[PDB]
Design a protein around this motif. Sequence first.
Motif, mmCIF file in Angstrom:
data_model
loop_
_atom_site.group_PDB
_atom_site.id
_atom_site.type_symbol
_atom_site.label_atom_id
_atom_site.label_comp_id
_atom_site.label_asym_id
_atom_site.label_seq_id
_atom_site.Cartn_x
_atom_site.Cartn_y
_atom_site.Cartn_z
ATOM 1 N N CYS A 183 -26.841 95.166 -1.072
ATOM 2 C CA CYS A 183 -25.190 94.206 -0.316
ATOM 3 C C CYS A 183 -24.139 95.719 -0.958
ATOM 4 O O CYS A 183 -22.281 95.247 -0.788
ATOM 5 N N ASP A 184 -24.337 95.444 -2.131
ATOM 6 C CA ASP A 184 -23.006 96.314 -2.916
ATOM 7 C C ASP A 184 -22.486 97.090 -2.930
ATOM 8 O O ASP A 184 -22.727 98.104 -1.517
ATOM 9 N N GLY A 185 -20.923 97.810 -2.694
ATOM 10 C CA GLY A 185 -20.785 99.282 -3.013
ATOM 11 C C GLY A 185 -20.645 99.490 -1.147
ATOM 12 O O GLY A 185 -20.733 100.628 -1.005
ATOM 13 N N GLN A 186 -19.531 98.840 -0.393
ATOM 14 C CA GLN A 186 -19.339 98.820 0.584
ATOM 15 C C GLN A 186 -18.506 98.224 0.853
ATOM 16 O O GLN A 186 -17.313 98.061 0.287
ATOM 17 N N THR A 187 -17.637 99.055 2.232
ATOM 18 C CA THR A 187 -16.085 98.330 2.255
ATOM 19 C C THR A 187 -16.424 97.047 3.173
ATOM 20 O O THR A 187 -17.693 96.299 3.050
ATOM 21 N N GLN A 188 -15.146 96.539 3.181
ATOM 22 C CA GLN A 188 -14.850 95.101 2.946
ATOM 23 C C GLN A 188 -15.920 94.254 4.343
ATOM 24 O O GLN A 188 -17.090 93.474 4.150
ATOM 25 N N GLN A 208 -18.864 95.397 5.988
ATOM 26 C CA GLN A 208 -19.896 95.972 5.738
ATOM 27 C C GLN A 208 -20.295 95.049 4.707
ATOM 28 O O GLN A 208 -21.709 94.448 4.632
ATOM 29 N N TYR A 209 -19.816 94.543 3.935
ATOM 30 C CA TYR A 209 -19.760 93.632 2.184
ATOM 31 C C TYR A 209 -20.848 92.742 3.107
ATOM 32 O O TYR A 209 -21.671 91.736 3.203
ATOM 33 N N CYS A 213 -23.687 92.485 5.192
ATOM 34 C CA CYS A 213 -25.045 92.217 4.840
ATOM 35 C C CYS A 213 -25.248 91.302 3.374
ATOM 36 O O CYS A 213 -26.174 90.467 3.919
#
Length: 32
Positions: A14-19, A21-22, A25
């Motif tokens: 789930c890392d590496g996303q905008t807020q 979407q994080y 996830c």
Amino acid sequence: DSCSEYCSNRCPSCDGQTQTQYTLCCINICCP
């Protein structure tokens, strides 16, 4: 990270996303 804000289990995928979407996830996929 890895959904530590929201879950006791860990999902680094789930890392590496905008807020939003994080958060999605984490709460729907990592620890629903």
